[PDB]
Write an enzyme that holds these catalytic residues in place. Structure first.
Site, short mmCIF file in Angstrom:
data_model
loop_
_atom_site.label_atom_id
_atom_site.label_comp_id
_atom_site.label_asym_id
_atom_site.label_seq_id
_atom_site.Cartn_x
_atom_site.Cartn_y
_atom_site.Cartn_z
N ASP A 37 51.68 49.63 19.81
CA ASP A 37 52.07 48.26 19.38
C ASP A 37 53.52 48.32 18.87
OD1 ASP A 37 49.52 47.20 20.09
OD2 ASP A 37 49.54 45.90 18.31
N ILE A 66 60.82 42.81 30.60
CA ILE A 66 62.18 43.40 30.46
C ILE A 66 62.16 44.76 29.76
CG2 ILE A 66 63.38 41.22 30.75
CD1 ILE A 66 63.93 41.17 27.74
N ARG A 89 59.28 47.42 28.39
CA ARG A 89 58.42 48.46 29.00
C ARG A 89 58.59 48.43 30.53
NH1 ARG A 89 53.40 46.66 25.23
NH2 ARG A 89 54.66 44.76 25.29
N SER A 90 58.63 47.24 31.12
CA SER A 90 58.77 47.06 32.58
C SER A 90 60.09 47.70 33.07
CB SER A 90 58.77 45.55 32.89
OG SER A 90 57.49 44.95 32.70
N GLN A 121 64.90 47.13 25.94
CA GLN A 121 65.01 46.14 24.83
C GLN A 121 65.51 46.80 23.53
OE1 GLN A 121 61.12 43.96 25.18
NE2 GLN A 121 62.31 42.24 24.36
N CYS A 173 55.14 43.40 31.56
CA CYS A 173 54.70 43.61 30.17
C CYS A 173 54.53 42.19 29.61
CB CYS A 173 55.62 44.62 29.49
SG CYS A 173 57.36 44.16 29.68
N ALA A 228 57.35 40.20 28.21
CA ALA A 228 58.56 39.47 28.68
C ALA A 228 58.94 39.92 30.11
CB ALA A 228 59.68 39.67 27.68
#
Ligand SMILES: CC[C@H](O)[C@@H]1N(C(=O)OC)[C@H]2CC[C@]1(O)CC2
Length: 281
Positions: free
Chosen positions: A180, A218, A220-221, A261, A214, A216
């Site tokens: 998390d 941006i 993890r993706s 991010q 994920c 958003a």
């Protein structure tokens, strides 16, 4: 070599600094379509928009808009669709996109609930005998099988175009153990997940681009497609010294804003590529 560059940034604690230079050099292209008032309820986050030039268009005459971008990595010969976690009202548009782009895999890097809030609609069936019908896009989705492992789940889905009665098999790769907060302590389970996606054929040129999300689409993706592309380039060149992860990230940021991010995700991306290099050198 990135391994030495890693020790330098790490020993100097310069991650927040590197990360900010990336932010300042990043491309800025118009996202006019995303900001039209008729599309406000198609976006999960008001500050995360696809660029007009790279946006995926739905083949529906009414409204073609979905918060999704095509990332085309020319030298690696890899494409990816990065999208947000679907909203209750865009689950049908999501599957329409999967159908229209001939994608074979969906990669999900979040849990439906994180930090006590919903990060994504439940967009696939939980039981074999309870299929989902998307009335707006004329698609039916059935769970065929589910393999639940410690760090992720693989699901076998059948997508049926109710208009033409064509069916395709879609693989859903669900990484379930991304914390998390922060990043996974070791990249081992993330690399094992990435190789599992590769082995499936979902990233292969005989199929449409893989759909990656994920919340958003941006952070993890971004880490997923940055690690995959860097490892592929190290094979094509078979030299872990010609590949600059900062240059690759900037090239990917021409296609979707904000990829990676936090400085933590950047450090994690390095660690993932450095460790994966051992298993490809
Ligand atoms: C390894 C490919 C993928 O995992 C698929 N699957 C699955 O759900 O995971 C084991 C079964 C084994 C081969 C499948 O392609 C089809 C059935």
């Amino acid at each position: 070599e990135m391994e030495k560059e890693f020790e330098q940034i790490d020993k100097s604690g310069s991650w927040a600094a590197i990360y900010q230079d990336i932010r300042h050099e990043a491309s800025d292209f118009p996202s006019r379509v995303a900001k039209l008032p008729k599309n406000k309820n198609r976006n999960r986050y008001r500050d995360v928009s696809p660029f007009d030039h790279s946006r995926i268009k739905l083949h529906q005459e009414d409204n073609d808009y979905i918060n999704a971008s095509l990332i085309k990595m020319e030298e690696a010969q890899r494409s990816y669709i990065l999208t947000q976690g679907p909203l209750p009202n865009t689950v049908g548009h999501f599957w329409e996109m999967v159908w229209e782009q001939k994608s074979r895999g969906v990669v999900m890097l979040n849990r439906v609930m994180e930090k006590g809030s919903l990060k994504c609609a439940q967009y696939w069936p939980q039981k074999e005998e309870k299929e989902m019908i998307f009335e707006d896009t004329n698609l039916k989705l059935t769970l065929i099988s589910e393999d639940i492992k410690s760090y992720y789940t693989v699901r076998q889905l059948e997508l049926e175009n109710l208009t033409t009665q064509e069916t395709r098999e879609i693989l859903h790769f669900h990484y379930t153990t991304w914390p998390d907060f922060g990043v996974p302590e070791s990249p081992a389970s993330f690399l094992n997940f990435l190789f599992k996606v590769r082995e499936s054929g979902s990233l292969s040129p005989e199929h449409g681009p893989v759909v990656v999300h994920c919340s958003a689409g941006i952070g993890r993706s971004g880490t997923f497609c940055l690690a995959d592309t860097c490892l592929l380039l190290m094979d094509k060149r078979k030299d872990p010294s010609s590949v600059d992860i900062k240059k690759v990230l900037l090239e990917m940021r021409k296609f979707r804003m904000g990829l990676i991010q936090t400085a933590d995700q950047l450090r994690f991306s390095y660690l993932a590529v450095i460790e994966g290099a051992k298993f490809i050198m």
